[PDB]
Design a protein that fits this description.
The structure is a homotetramer of 385-residue chains.
Chain A lengths: L2 E2 L3 H28 L4 H9 L18 H14 L1 H20 L2 H13 L4 E4 L15 E5 L2 E12 L6 E7 L8 H4 E7 L5 E6 L10 E12 L10 H35 L3 E2 L2 E2 L4 H29 L5 H26 L10 H8 L9 H13 L4
Bound molecules: octanoyl-coenzyme A (4 copies) and flavin-adenine dinucleotide (4 copies).
PDB class: oxidoreductase
Keywords: oxidoreductase
Assembly: tetrameric
Chain lengths: 385, 385, 385, 385
Amino acid sequence: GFSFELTEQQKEFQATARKFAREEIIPVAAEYDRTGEYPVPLLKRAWELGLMNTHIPESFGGLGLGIIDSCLITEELAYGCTGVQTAIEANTLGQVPLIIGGNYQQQKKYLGRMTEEPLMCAYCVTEPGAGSDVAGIKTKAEKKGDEYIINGQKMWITNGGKANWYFLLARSDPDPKAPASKAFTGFIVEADTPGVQIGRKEINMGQRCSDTRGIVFEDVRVPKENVLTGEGAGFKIAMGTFDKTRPPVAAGAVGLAQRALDEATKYALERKTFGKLLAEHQGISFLLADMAMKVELARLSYQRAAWEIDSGRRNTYYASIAKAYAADIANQLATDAVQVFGGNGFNTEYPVEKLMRDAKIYQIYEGTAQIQRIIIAREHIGRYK
Amino acid sequence: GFSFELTEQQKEFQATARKFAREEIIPVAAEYDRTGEYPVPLLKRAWELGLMNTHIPESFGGLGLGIIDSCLITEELAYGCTGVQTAIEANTLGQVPLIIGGNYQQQKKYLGRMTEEPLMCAYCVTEPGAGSDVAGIKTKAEKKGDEYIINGQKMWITNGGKANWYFLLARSDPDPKAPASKAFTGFIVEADTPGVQIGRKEINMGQRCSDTRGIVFEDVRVPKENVLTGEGAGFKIAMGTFDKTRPPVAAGAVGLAQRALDEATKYALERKTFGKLLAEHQGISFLLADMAMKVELARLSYQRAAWEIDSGRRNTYYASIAKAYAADIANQLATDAVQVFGGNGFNTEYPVEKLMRDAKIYQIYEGTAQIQRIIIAREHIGRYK
Amino acid sequence: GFSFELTEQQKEFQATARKFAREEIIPVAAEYDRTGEYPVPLLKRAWELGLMNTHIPESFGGLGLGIIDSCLITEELAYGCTGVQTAIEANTLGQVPLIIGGNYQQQKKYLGRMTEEPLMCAYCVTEPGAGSDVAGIKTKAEKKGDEYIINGQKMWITNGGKANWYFLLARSDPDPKAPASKAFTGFIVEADTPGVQIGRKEINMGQRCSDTRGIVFEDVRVPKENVLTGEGAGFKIAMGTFDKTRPPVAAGAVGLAQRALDEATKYALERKTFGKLLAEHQGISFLLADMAMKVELARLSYQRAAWEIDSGRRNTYYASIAKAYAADIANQLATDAVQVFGGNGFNTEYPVEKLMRDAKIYQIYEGTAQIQRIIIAREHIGRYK
Amino acid sequence: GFSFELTEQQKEFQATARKFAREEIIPVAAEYDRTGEYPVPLLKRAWELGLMNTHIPESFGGLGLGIIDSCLITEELAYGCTGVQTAIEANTLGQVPLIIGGNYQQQKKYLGRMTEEPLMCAYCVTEPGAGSDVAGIKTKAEKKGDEYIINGQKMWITNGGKANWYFLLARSDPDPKAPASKAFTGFIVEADTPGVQIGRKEINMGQRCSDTRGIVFEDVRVPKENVLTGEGAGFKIAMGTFDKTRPPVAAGAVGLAQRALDEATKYALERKTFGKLLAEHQGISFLLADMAMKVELARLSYQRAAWEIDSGRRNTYYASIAKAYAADIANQLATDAVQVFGGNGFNTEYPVEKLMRDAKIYQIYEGTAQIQRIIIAREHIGRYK
Ligand SMILES: CCCCCCCC(=O)SCCNC(=O)CCNC(=O)[C@H](O)C(C)(C)COP(=O)(O)OP(=O)(O)OC[C@H]1O[C@@H](n2cnc3c(N)ncnc32)[C@H](O)[C@@H]1OP(=O)(O)O
Ligand SMILES: CCCCCCCC(=O)SCCNC(=O)CCNC(=O)[C@H](O)C(C)(C)COP(=O)(O)OP(=O)(O)OC[C@H]1O[C@@H](n2cnc3c(N)ncnc32)[C@H](O)[C@@H]1OP(=O)(O)O
Ligand SMILES: CCCCCCCC(=O)SCCNC(=O)CCNC(=O)[C@H](O)C(C)(C)COP(=O)(O)OP(=O)(O)OC[C@H]1O[C@@H](n2cnc3c(N)ncnc32)[C@H](O)[C@@H]1OP(=O)(O)O
Ligand SMILES: CCCCCCCC(=O)SCCNC(=O)CCNC(=O)[C@H](O)C(C)(C)COP(=O)(O)OP(=O)(O)OC[C@H]1O[C@@H](n2cnc3c(N)ncnc32)[C@H](O)[C@@H]1OP(=O)(O)O
Ligand SMILES: Cc1cc2nc3c(=O)[nH]c(=O)nc-3n(C[C@H](O)[C@H](O)[C@H](O)COP(=O)(O)OP(=O)(O)OC[C@H]3O[C@@H](n4cnc5c(N)ncnc54)[C@H](O)[C@@H]3O)c2cc1C
Ligand SMILES: Cc1cc2nc3c(=O)[nH]c(=O)nc-3n(C[C@H](O)[C@H](O)[C@H](O)COP(=O)(O)OP(=O)(O)OC[C@H]3O[C@@H](n4cnc5c(N)ncnc54)[C@H](O)[C@@H]3O)c2cc1C
Ligand SMILES: Cc1cc2nc3c(=O)[nH]c(=O)nc-3n(C[C@H](O)[C@H](O)[C@H](O)COP(=O)(O)OP(=O)(O)OC[C@H]3O[C@@H](n4cnc5c(N)ncnc54)[C@H](O)[C@@H]3O)c2cc1C
Ligand SMILES: Cc1cc2nc3c(=O)[nH]c(=O)nc-3n(C[C@H](O)[C@H](O)[C@H](O)COP(=O)(O)OP(=O)(O)OC[C@H]3O[C@@H](n4cnc5c(N)ncnc54)[C@H](O)[C@@H]3O)c2cc1C
């Protein structure tokens, strides 16, 4: 039977995440956007609150939460700032591969350490020449005795220069004609390994306090015991990762949509034009209505997709719907939020212009808007074919 | 926690409704749209199958199903023909008022009959001069000893010429400055009462097999025992009704969207142009994807709204979101479906132009797209104010 | 220098077209939609008014008007009814090929006769298996001595069963590998020729009084002197035809958008809800505003495209923009027009539901919405390549 | 008849503006957005080139160009940077009032100086408490013998800290029940007048090189000879100004749309994914097509609006359509352009995220998207009423 009711435990995680988001993140999110520092103090706290690495199984000192849980928490954090929240989320991204494709030993060693200190990790797939086309990746891995030799370059890595270790997808089969399903290998690469050249901090339009860099791998030596399931099983792990990790990215976008909604509404209830409150102009109340409608829909789609995977079923279809839809409305609301503010909305002393800048990324990373329509269409047709 | 899982009981109604809709409705739907006959044989069948009057409590020989159940069923019926489904739902519409504001004697008598014979009923609010503005209604109810004299005209009444009895909203407080909450009285009126003048069958663009007529009420005598809760409680019963009754109309709209999607998909997997299957042109695959996205989103919204009211809480906000969103996407899908059929889609021998004609009403009846925004805004704003 | 000013001659054509459209077409357009007769009386009058075949050069007794002229006149006619107007427009469609690819003799004989009586003609390209893909046409033409032998079937021919003669595109080169630019031939085929089997009147959603039928060609013998420019020049003539003929189809759609706009506005200025005129609700006035905006834009795009060809330049790009855009807004306005009418809009006694049904075709024939985006994109890229 | 043909004179300004914009603006635009410096060297150049103060009559050493001319130029400038272009247009904004409501002495003095030196001016209407509602302004103008005492605050003034003189709209009628048409007076005020307190430079999301500040006016003394037409004629000069001045803002928006389109196209013809050029994915070709459609449509609308006013007729209706439509599509194109750049589009080293930040203002200044609908509606409705 249907249920849209949170558990008391969930209600508590949510309250914690909300309180920290609004009491700690909000008051400083603006300064961090301006300066573009790494929000170390915030991450630290988030760690102590147990609002990071939430998905690490209990066996490794983790909380062992589900995808539903992460979404719930990450909707709250995103509300404060998606710059900060992205830092946090990236940790889970680099961890999932391990959780779903790692052995006890690999898990214990790399997931275990995240539990002990406030360490960070990153997910390295994208390259200058390939992002959407993962099968177009050119980073190569060559087996030499008991180790692998990694040569290649990765681009746009969140937590790029702050990561303890990286999950790294490389092409292990040189045969150009080798199929995607057996041409790649997933590795755990320690950032301190000789040969990893961390690039400069890339300066983007939004999520400015987030660390995004390119990375070069020059003859990096990785022990075979850092291969995750085996040689060739790299593609499947990547794909399997997006299904658990898309819902939470959808939840971030409807956090940033909720913020926009809250700001717009509050303002409309204060500002007057032509003798009436903004909210009293039918054209504005209609915009607020439309805005509200979208947030609820998008919150509803990520819950569906998260529940699906938590139930132990493939959620590719629902996850893409969620990421596709959540990304679009966060973008729509962001722009509609500065509109409501008028001249003030375009101004940097107000909180909505930041939102409009942060929102854009949701339509690009973790599978572009267009890539999502490719997945959905393929998954959709599959039921008539 | 969350659950998007049907009960084994709900799975069975669902199967029943589906089989009925695809084996019995679909094959004749087209020929009822053309002739505009009342689908008598279909309604009888739906009654026997127990896919009608689903909300009548057990005490009066009903199934005493919830709103989640009604929705589930409706979505299956609507897939077949919303012309036929609208006939069915009109029944639930006239019944609800009776269920939420009637006494045992009233329910026993009027609800009890619905459970004995395949009888129909109708909801009479709308007038020539007022639809959206139900505070604008002018049909008067004047107290004359132990009865009320009713004078007025109702317009666009579903089942108007086929109902055994009517729920009738009338103005009982003559004072123009009287508030809505106290100026109207709800009555249950038997169609055979002298003075009720049923008009001709109205020819509309869609849902042509549905019976919708105008009704004149001159000097209609109604016993005081037919007053629903009390004089003045009219307004509240009406609004109370829309909350229970908005979700199922939404579900009807995402059934007519599912159908559109199924037809378009099947066609896209057969027709060829420029050497490729329609589904192979990225232009079309993207269109199909957006279509699936909206169906899933709309389904989720009515589910939420239904669960809410079943849980014992007022769902005005969620109900209006679902009604408004489902309504819009039904209309978008209908036209896009006609579009991937090309030239054949404009033709009467293919099933999608009916869908297009049918869909338009969803943005009008049971609270107009604009009226839905008014409600959402009001409900939304009240959480900040 | 810029000028959006009509010539006095143009002002006069317009006045004539407007007066006839509103005094003769409107009062009977509804009855013709219902019955689906051919509006013979109207066509007759239109002929006498000199509102038909407007593009026939003066040399053949024609008025020799330009594309700007046709658009202007046809915007006025379409306002009355696109069912009727389509009949008229089809004449020009079948004539253009002749005007641009025929010799003095062919022109004199077939264009000349249109000037003498109120005859009709049709354009035959589309087949059951191919519409959008003209190069996919299978009607074959085989040269036998001094004549050609035509075998094949055409579908969806406007004026199909009322045409004196037809322009007919057939594949004259059996080599499957033969290029589009030399594989087809354009013919003038007299309807009375033994072997042409006119099909039944197809029943569609809109433009119901228009004659649309499929046609079979069984060993039809056509004199070589009915070939238009020569064997192989068939494709180019077809393509060349759409460029002169798209603007006027765009003008029809913004005629049907203007009607919708006029009806919606008038109604909004009469109907009251919640004490105010519809026009006084900001949400409605905003809809009317948006509606007005679209019509002006679309009228502006067809004028650009018509002027382009009249200046003796290739207008493929502007023509597609116009047809694409005009088709979409007519559709948007049609639905927004019934919305404004409320319950009445869905009703067949009101004039907007017809409009919503008529409008859909604009997105399909004379190059689908999708096909237009293909042309535009190709023409657009061409300027950077 | 119709003409979409530029004069040989207009072709030359156009070339001049284009060359300036691509050879001088583009190369430094990026570095002015980052530093937010006033583009002094660029403005000087524009002045020498004669691409500034274009509307000043010949009598005062001007070019005495029309609105069509201004638009043509502006579109070219805006293509480069609307940050820089906005500085330029602000000049024309403060000048117009003077041109339509000033005497010879006023024009000679204040317009004459603009033609001698590369001086700037500003338009001062907007206040902290009122922007959209210019009848809501509170800066008072009190008559004191032969001068007026001005008290109030202006907000968001373009060129506010760089202008030689200001056009200043003030309330001269203290009576609250006084009509807009008689309650305001227009003044020309010299920036060096004791009492004018220019605020700090405001940091906005876009058009960062543009100077926009708040200004306090306490006990500012203005000679009666600086009153534009007469006491009370303020309102009408202001509205009169927007009509001449809306078209060019529209043109600025379709320059920033043209740029977005050019960048996206160029990129789509270089980047490869899944073995094909971005432009080769139908998904993208369709997006590109829609983009081109809107640019062409918006260009046409400002042309129409400009021609109208140049023809000597009130263009309120057309001006607002152009402002509203151009504004919207500039915003749609900016985000779609960022989209086909993928990850690089979010990065500061690529030219499209600036476009996105820049574009948002177009939906706010010079009459808000909502205010434009109000005007269109009013203008539209008045043709039936
Ligand atoms: C907020 C969080 C903070 C961090 C933010 C930053 C995070 C990021 O941006 S990471 C982003 C990385 N970039 C991407 O997301 C791009 C992803 N793009 C894709 O998903 C793919 O390229 C996609 C789905 C289009 C597939 O392309 P394609 O080349 O055709 O492979 P395809 O042929 O479909 O499949 C190959 C094999 O994989 C399998 N496969 C495909 N999809 C899936 C799936 N979803 N699940 C499982 N297996 C799959 C197939 O079954 C196939 O197997 P086999 O050989 O046995 O038949
Ligand atoms: C598929 C099925 C087949 C049949 C299909 C055909 C069925 C139909 O088409 S019937 C069409 C339905 N028509 C409509 O829904 C019209 C929409 N109209 C409305 O909902 C309302 O009039 C609406 C929302 C616009 C409000 O206008 P208004 O007249 O000003 O009432 P308002 O002043 O807001 O409220 C008056 C009182 O009602 C109360 N009220 C309002 N909404 C509610 C509610 N949801 N629950 C309880 N009370 C409510 C208010 O609290 C207020 O009370 P109080 O005095 O105690 O404070
Ligand atoms: C209101 C009026 C009443 C009547 C209403 C009813 C009227 C109708 O519906 S008639 C509708 C007929 N159906 C259509 O409109 C479908 C039209 N579809 C098309 O336009 C095309 O198929 C189209 C443009 C996609 C081209 O496809 P394609 O197969 O790739 O041909 P393509 O390779 O582009 O070109 C082949 C040759 O034609 C030329 N060509 C292509 N487009 C054009 C053009 N616009 N102008 C001139 N030449 C052209 C090419 O240059 C090429 O030449 P070459 O061999 O010398 O290099
Ligand atoms: C790119 C350039 C760089 C610089 C960029 C920065 C520039 C800027 O941002 S300045 C921003 C501009 N701000 C605006 O445009 C705000 C929009 N506000 C308005 O236009 C109006 O206030 C508007 C349309 C809402 C009307 O509200 P309202 O106060 O009620 O006036 P209203 O009552 O309608 O009319 C009052 C009188 O004015 C007259 N009026 C209205 N419009 C006009 C007009 N276009 N022409 C002449 N008279 C007019 C009416 O006729 C009426 O007169 P009367 O008494 O004789 O009958
Ligand atoms: C701030 C930021 C953080 C990021 N974090 C990470 C990270 O931690 N780890 C990581 O691995 N990556 C990360 N990414 C990269 C991100 O995953 C990619 O940018 C995204 O997948 C898009 O790929 P791309 O940039 O190569 O664009 P491209 O793939 O080149 O695409 C360009 C455009 O073409 C479209 N397109 C491409 N292929 C097709 C097709 N077949 N059909 C239709 N349209 C198509 C795309 O939609 C896009 O609009 C990050 C990027 C950014 C900007
Ligand atoms: C086939 C059919 C079946 C029906 N079945 C029933 C039934 O069984 N029982 C019954 O009682 N009624 C029924 N109705 C009537 C239906 O509920 C109304 O038509 C619908 O509520 C719209 O009201 P209206 O027709 O009066 O339009 P109006 O209320 O006159 O409104 C006209 C337009 O103005 C807009 N509008 C109105 N007020 C506002 C406002 N304040 N702000 C902004 N926009 C506004 C509306 O969106 C609409 O577009 C039926 C109608 C149809 C066509
Ligand atoms: C009332 C009516 C009157 C008509 N009058 C005439 C007439 O007088 N003369 C005449 O010759 N024809 C006429 N036509 C036919 C009309 O030209 C075609 O119906 C139209 O071109 C569409 O082709 P189709 O029906 O084959 O659809 P298809 O070409 O089969 O297309 C089906 C769907 O797929 C899409 N599609 C097809 N190819 C592609 C592609 N490569 N990329 C992306 N999407 C694609 C189309 O957009 C459409 O949505 C008429 C049609 C109608 C309905
Ligand atoms: C960079 C910049 C430069 C500027 N340059 C100048 C300049 O040179 N000179 C000058 O005088 N001003 C200038 N402006 C100010 C600009 O004109 C106003 O900000 C714009 O008119 C919006 O007014 P507002 O900010 O007061 O928003 P408000 O008027 O407060 O409105 C807030 C929101 O409510 C909506 N709204 C308001 N009234 C209604 C209504 N009746 N119905 C429906 N919706 C409504 C608006 O759409 C908006 O979304 C500038 C502003 C900026 C940001």
